[PDB]
């Protein structure tokens, strides 16, 4: 019934809703209005897909709630799988097992894929019989269309000893490794050919190459037990070896995206690092998002636009997203209602639109679900205006909450 992923803040964003002239539909693929910024996102999305130009930087700026993280998720969903999209917050680089500069380069290099195309051949069938002469033996395998004998040589019989003493299992044997994997007790047995040549297109980030080759069993990319790779040596020769895979047929590189949400949280050490990390061939596109105005940069006393130093703002293109009118607000609320299970009166939509246009958009989006539940209490089936008024009284927004501080409490 309920899987891991459930209804979140950006679930309705199925893509960046553009015509293929990179022209935004006023409402499509879950995205509403925000035309100039969305079409700018379209241009940079096609620039991502082209891939020929390295280390480009886009800042998407605007008030809180004006669709900028929504635009970033729209780019991620429009780009689809099998092109890296590494999404982090600026707060992620502040770490205790590695320095902020090193975490930032690691983020850069999770964001470049290497696409490597490999042919193996895979056996898949139901075990009919197996033998042991204490050592040599034989194995008979069955697909619904054929059966055969195989000779169990030393490595194969050793491998099959790992989970033995059962038959009728439907299993796969990789002729490269001898890696046995069993689907279960004959779940149905397989169709077609027993043994087939098979192709896999692995896409592996540069961070994964770097980590796998850092150490014996260095493939702990699963738990971040690396603490700063040996740059200029175990990282320069991986760049060289990938450049050797390329222009020969072994591999092709897939330059992805690094989305740094809330980049105002980086500090001037980190920004100074970005300056040069953006200038190499293996630099992905990074796009980054910021609410803040002209504010103090972290780590110093300097005021700057977006809280980003000016010598890095020189290095990027600044999309501006703009606040929403009544019509766009109403349409966003409708799409949120359609992503959730709720239905509302048109008068309820009107009241909620004015509520959200008064205080803030995100508060109204939150009220949707609360009003749905409130109507469910009285065993209604469509959210009415008095549901919204009740919920508006139960749950305050920041402005009215601040106004209610006409009594006193700690500081």
């Amino acid at each position: 019934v309920t899987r891991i992923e459930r209804i979140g803040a950006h679930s309705h964003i199925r893509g960046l809703g553009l015509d293929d002239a990179l022209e935004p539909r006023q409402a499509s693929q879950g995205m509403v209005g925000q035309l100039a910024a969305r079409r700018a996102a379209g241009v940079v999305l096609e620039m991502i897909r082209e891939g020929k130009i390295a280390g480009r930087a886009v800042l998407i700026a605007g008030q809180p709630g004006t669709g900028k993280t929504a635009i970033a998720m729209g780019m991620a969903q429009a780009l689809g799988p099998d092109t890296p999209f590494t999404a982090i917050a600026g707060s992620e680089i502040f770490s205790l097992e590695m320095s902020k500069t090193e975490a930032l380069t690691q983020a850069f290099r999770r964001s470049i894929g290497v696409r490597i195309k490999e042919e193996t051949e895979i056996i898949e069938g139901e075990v009919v019989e197996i033998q042991i002469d204490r050592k040599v033996g034989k194995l008979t395998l069955k697909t619904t269309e054929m059966e055969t004998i195989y000779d169990l040589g030393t490595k194969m019989i050793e491998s099959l000893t790992k989970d033995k003493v059962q038959a009728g299992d439907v299993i796969t044997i990789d002729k490269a490794t001898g890696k046995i994997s069993k689907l279960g007790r004959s779940v149905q047995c397989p169709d077609g050919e027993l043994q087939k040549r098979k192709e896999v297109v692995h896409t592996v980030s540069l961070h994964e190459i770097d980590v796998i080759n850092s150490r014996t069993q260095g493939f702990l990319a699963l738990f971040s037990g690396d603490t700063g790779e040996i740059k200029s040596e175990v990282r320069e020769q991986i760049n060289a070896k990938v450049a050797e895979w390329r222009e020969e047929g072994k591999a092709e590189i897939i330059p992805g995206v690094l989305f740094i949400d809330e980049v105002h949280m980086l500090d001037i050490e980190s920004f100074s690092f970005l300056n040069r990390a953006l200038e190499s061939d293996m630099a992905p596109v990074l796009i980054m998002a910021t609410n803040r105005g002209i504010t103090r940069i972290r780590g110093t006393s300097y005021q700057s636009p977006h809280g980003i130093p000016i010598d890095l703002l020189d290095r990027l293109l600044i999309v501006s997203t703009t606040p929403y009118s009544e019509k766009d607000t109403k349409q966003i609320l409708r799409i949120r209602c359609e992503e959730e299970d709720v239905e509302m009166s048109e008068d309820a939509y009107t009241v909620l639109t004015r509520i959200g246009l008064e205080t803030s958009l995100r508060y109204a989006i939150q009220l949707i679900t609360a009003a749905s539940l409130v109507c469910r209490k009285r065993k209604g089936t469509e959210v009415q205006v008095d549901d919204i008024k009740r919920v508006y009284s139960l749950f305050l927004d920041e402005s009215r909450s601040t106004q209610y501080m006409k009594e006193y409490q700690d500081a």
């Binding site: 008979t140 269309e145 054929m146 059966e147 055969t148 004998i149 195989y150 027993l194 043994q195």
Partner: protein, 113 residues
Amino acid sequence: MVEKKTSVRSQDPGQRRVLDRAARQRRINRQLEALENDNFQNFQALLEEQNLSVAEGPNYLTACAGPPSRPQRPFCAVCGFPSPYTCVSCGARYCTVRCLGTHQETRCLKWTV
């Protein structure tokens, strides 16, 4: 009209009773001699004067190389291409489901008498 083979019902394998082990050898041997055989699809005199020629010194019989170091390769025998599979009954090799089909219909168990 009718399916027109239930009258002859040739194989009807409820009692199939596979042929195996030494029988395989017989087949192998037969095939070998057939590949060694002659026009008809004096050999007795050849065998007789060869059994006159039996001795331990360097001669016809003692001039045989023997088994090879390079191990035997699989081939399909229906189209002759390399064959990952073996027929469970007779041990002859093949490379597809189609080839197993043809083999089961014409060469598996049928010529072992």
